[PDB]
Symmetry: C2
């Protein structure tokens, strides 16, 4: 356990946009009906504690609701939330640069259905051979879906699963936070 360097660290909220940022993290939460996470640019994923001194809206937080895990320098902030999503302990955190937003991966769809599997490791939309997986689902997430963008392609949040079970060479996250 340790605390992130606050030397180059800027946290600001103004005009319906809240930002938590440092040298490698840029996290944006916005007000549209309600406040929620909108974008996160993580140059490199790191492991430290985001200092409370630079944390907005940090009263009574549910750690399991923190989209970016608190162990991964995710701000202990209610801005670090999105309805229908829990902490992304099995996101593609080992891919290097990782960008999070809430939007569909190109060529794919996501459907709310009770017939969907549980939260699992984040899955890339393209197989090893580059084949696209088009049909996805989630049990109780909200739309637009949680999306990851790394150097190898586009991924979905833990809540979003491929709804076909004959998917073979699936590329998934192997990390556990």
């Amino acid at each position: 356990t340790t605390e992130c360097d606050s030397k180059i660290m800027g946290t600001a909220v103004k005009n319906n946009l809240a930002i938590h940022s440092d040298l490698s993290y840029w996290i944006e939460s916005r007000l549209n009906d309600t406040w929620k996470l909108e974008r996160a640019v993580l140059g490199e994923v790191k492991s430290c504690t985001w200092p409370e001194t630079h944390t907005l809206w940090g009263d009574g937080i549910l750690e399991s609701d923190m989209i970016i895990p608190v162990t991964l320098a995710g701000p202990r902030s209610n801005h670090n939330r999105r309805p229908g999503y829990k902490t992304q302990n099995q996101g593609p955190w080992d891919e290097g640069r990782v960008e999070i937003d809430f939007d569909y991966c190109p060529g794919t769809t996501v459907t709310l259905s009770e017939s969907c599997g549980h939260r699992g490791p984040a899955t890339r939309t393209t197989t090893e051979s580059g084949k696209l997986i088009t049909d996805w689902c989630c049990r109780s997430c909200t739309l637009p879906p949680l999306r990851y963008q790394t150097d190898s392609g586009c991924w979905y949040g833990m809540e979003i699963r491929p709804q076909r079970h004959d998917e073979k060479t699936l590329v998934q996250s192997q990390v556990n936070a």
Copy 2:
């Protein structure tokens, strides 16, 4: 009970300076050995709740430690603190424009002594006739002293009392938060 308008409201921390601000409030906290309140410019004192969405460092706060009372739109933030000072419920809040900083009133001194009286209403350093009260004390405050600046002159925090008891035409705060 109600919440302040966040339309024109900006809260930001960067380079050892944390600011909580809106149309009438400008509150500055800074890092020097530790983080603490440094200046507060209140164009007009108001009564609402500073929204947690725009509050830095709001985990586990002691309301009695909030320099600017939470009932007076004081941010429920640990930035809204100064060591040796409690909530200023009896500050000069009815004087209109009120500026808070931590510095001595001109011509005055403040001494730490156990011989000092309890926290009372904020006292102006000049009497009704304009006579200056030079000698002040506090039981357990820290220096530099909490200072108020209004249109009628310079005041001290509740902790700081005149150490002479023959002070007659004393000008004090009559408000109770």
